Ligand binder design. Structure first.
Ligand code: HEM
Length: 399
């Protein structure tokens, strides 16, 4: 049983193991850091099965759950939020904050997403590059998703820059465990104060809605509200930052596509669709434990055994996506859903918001900076460690 997670074949590529497994052993056992075993599912149809089967559980207190790291096993001890719940608890809590993320709500949020992007671009422009290239991640990819979610949660404008920096420290590879936990506790402390404040004088934000609709009636307590707000903040932020950076690098990598996008920003939506399929920046979030025996392919997964369903592999499944390893914004899409945001009840709560942010970014970036260019050989791009999810640490650009 090979050790898992696997390492990316190279900076921008997925682990080489998946293609081989999809062809010769689509459902196989892998070995986790603690020596335990787990079933790895690599085919699109099977990943969808795991994501929706009622015989599988997301509860991390179940023996057999596939924790992939030492830290993961520790976090599994904290009280759970909806990300780690099964029905009926799952939707009972998730529906408390879903309103803000509906397709309709996100459509109404579009002008705000656009002004946020426009302002950040203007700041990056007036920040010039006269004395050298700028780091597109720090100056743009990081603040876009950060300012948006923080603002949606209820954070005041003046605190955005500092809070964006602290949240980044949580996941920065350079941060020490101490600095990471310190930033973590700090954000939690800050949200606690926001909840106390909003309980007294509610405003138009997620935290206020939680306080008024759930804390006051007694449906959840203050700490619960804090944890839910924290989940929404930390869940997909770092992924959003990486997707934006990955998007720019990909366009640099494929001049033809960039030319087409520049000529027709209306293609932004399809570019984003292909990006979320091609670069599956969140590939280790579909995990379960079997509540009872379940058959998947030619394998029997016994009760209490763990399962990891790779949506990254599913997104390269040649049986669903023709020429899966080719980035093609003009790709002819199959009836099957790409799985960059998961599948089933747990499907990313912010999928529509995420796509709206990316679409806004790629329909505006090259309009503002037609000559935007990565100011370093593409082969030198600073990617996240190969043993981690795909992403980019920093990206020097000129425009
Ligand atoms: C391009 C960026 C993003 C990607 C690629 C992404 C991907 C994912 C994936 C793969 C899952 C697992 C879904 C499943 O269990 O099937 C997920 C869950 C989740 N994401 Fe995201 N996400 C992104 C952005 C966001 C943002 C912006 C937020 C925060 C506002 C967010 C909040 C969450 C939450 C709370 C869950 C858990 C949902 C549940 O279990 O019910 N995501 N995301």
């Amino acid at each position: 049983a090979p050790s898992f997670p696997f390492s990316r074949a190279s900076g921008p590529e997925p682990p080489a193991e998946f293609a081989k497994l999809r062809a010769t052993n689509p459902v196989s056992q892998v070995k986790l850091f603690d020596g335990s075993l787990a079933w790895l599912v690599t085919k699109h149809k099977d990943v969808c099965f795991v994501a929706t089967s009622e015989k599988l559980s997301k509860v991390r207190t179940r023996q057999g759950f596939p924790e992939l790291s030492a830290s993961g096993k520790q976090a599994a001890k904290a009280k759970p939020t909806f990300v780690d719940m099964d029905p009926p608890e799952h939707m009972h809590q998730r529906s408390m904050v879903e309103p803000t993320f509906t397709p309709e709500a996100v459509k109404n949020l579009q002008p705000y997403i656009q002004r946020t992007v426009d302002d950040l671009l203007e700041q990056m422009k007036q920040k010039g590059c006269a004395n050298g290239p700028v780091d597109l991640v720090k100056e743009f990819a990081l603040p876009v998703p950060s300012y948006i979610i923080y603002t949606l949660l209820g954070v005041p404008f003046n605190d955005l820059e500092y809070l964006t920096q602290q949240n980044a420290i949580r996941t920065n590879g350079s941060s020490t465990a101490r600095e990471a936990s310190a930033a973590n506790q700090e954000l939690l402390d800050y949200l606690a104060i926001l909840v106390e404040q909003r309980l007294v004088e509610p405003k138009d934000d997620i935290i206020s809605k939680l306080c008024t609709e759930q804390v006051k009636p007694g449906n959840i307590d203050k700490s619960d509200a804090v944890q839910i707000a924290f989940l929404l903040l930390v869940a997909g932020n770092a992924t959003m930052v990486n997707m934006i950076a990955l998007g720019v690098a990909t366009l640099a990598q494929h001049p033809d596509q960039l030319a087409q996008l520049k000529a027709n920003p209306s293609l932004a939506p399809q570019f984003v669709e292909e990006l979320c399929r091609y670069h599956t920046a969140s590939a280790l979030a579909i995990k379960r434990t079997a509540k009872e025996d379940v058959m998947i392919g030619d394998k029997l997964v016994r009760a209490n055994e763990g399962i990891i369903a790779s949506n990254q592999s599913a997104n390269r499944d040649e049986e669903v996506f023709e020429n899966p390893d080719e980035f093609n914004m003009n790709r002819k899409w199959p009836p099957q859903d790409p799985l960059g945001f998961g599948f089933g009840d747990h499907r990313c709560i912010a999928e529509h918001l995420a796509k709206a942010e990316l679409t806004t970014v790629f329909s505006t970036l090259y309009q503002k900076f037609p000559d935007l260019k990565v100011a370093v050989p593409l082969g030198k791009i600073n990617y996240t460690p190969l043993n981690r999810d795909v992403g980019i640490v920093d990206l020097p650009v000129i425009f």
